């Protein structure tokens, strides 16, 4: 419960699903790059980290920035990965 907090979570997606439904994206008026969670799966890999809620910001994945990434590109950036998804997540809680 602090601002400026980042969690680098490493997950292995279970049959093509970490467990987050993506929203936001550069196409929306976000911080010029970032995908965000709209919905958490109850007990996929993502929720099994669980420091996420339905508010947080994905800034980078596998060390790969969501720079210029929109809905489709953000999926591609999470989905077409080398199994391990190191999610660089920022707080969905404002200062």
């Amino acid at each position: 419960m602090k601002p400026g907090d980042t969690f680098e979570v490493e997950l292995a997606k279970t049959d093509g699903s970490l467990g987050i439904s993506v929203t936001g994206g550069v196409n929306t008026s976000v911080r010029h790059g970032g995908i965000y969670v709209k919905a958490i799966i109850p007990k996929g890999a993502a929720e099994s980290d669980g420091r996420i809620h339905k508010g947080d910001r994905v800034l980078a994945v596998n060390g790969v920035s969501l720079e210029g990434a929109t809905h489709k590109q953000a999926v591609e950036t999470l989905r077409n990965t080398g199994q391990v998804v190191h999610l660089l997540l920022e707080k969905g809680q404002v200062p």
Binding site: K13, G16, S17, L18, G19, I20, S21, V22, T23, K38, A39, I41, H71, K72, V75, L78, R79
Partner: peptide, 6 residues
């Protein structure tokens, strides 16, 4: 589209 489980 939005909201894609991945």
């Amino acid at each position: 589209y939005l909201v894609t489980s991945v």
